[PDB]
Design a protein around this nucleic acid. Sequence first.
DNA 1: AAATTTGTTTAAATTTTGAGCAAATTT
DNA 2: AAATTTGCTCAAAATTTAAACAAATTT
Lengths: 91, 98
Amino acid sequence: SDVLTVSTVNSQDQVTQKPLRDSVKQALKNYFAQLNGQDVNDLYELVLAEVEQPLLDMVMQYTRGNQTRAALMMGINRGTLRKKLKKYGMN
Amino acid sequence: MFEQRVNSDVLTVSTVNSQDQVTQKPLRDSVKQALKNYFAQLNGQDVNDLYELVLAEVEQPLLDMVMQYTRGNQTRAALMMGINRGTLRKKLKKYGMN
DNA sequence: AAATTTGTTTAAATTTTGAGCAAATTT
DNA sequence: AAATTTGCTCAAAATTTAAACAAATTT
């Protein structure tokens, strides 16, 4: 009923799903905590970089290197995909 | 003395390791795992929105969290995310945060 | 009362898209 | 040897941008 989820363990050794979006929330909750009113400047492209890399990594692995099927899977242009690959230097 | 904090270790999540010890692992890895799992259930239906699907999962909480920080200040929020104020308002609208 | 933010528009800059081709690669 | 994918170009379509500025708000 909620497609992108990570595995957690509780004190009683029970594994159980939680939305990835709860992780993102936690990480930021943590990031901000460690900052002491130090200014943040490029937080969107920061988190984006943190998410695009592993997404590209995985779909390219799943599509066996096939840029065409990878782009179709993600629903973006083949050109866009190429650009993003070179951006993170994976090609 | 300043220790190097790599980019992968700026956004981290508490995990439990093979010795039942609590450690901080990259958000990257959470995104990897979510996708490894998403592909397991995909045996073997086709997809055509994987970027938008992921993007939404990540934008909502970022927006959620940044607004809480700026105590609803859209100008400071857009300034700290580093995006035009107009696209922040657009994104907020997309997710019902206004 | 002053400083700031919101809500909105308008136009330029930027990025994404699609389409189309030969050369390379997989099948 | 056929079929598909790569690498690369152009354009237009779509989106992000900054720059207003009056009205609403927060300091």
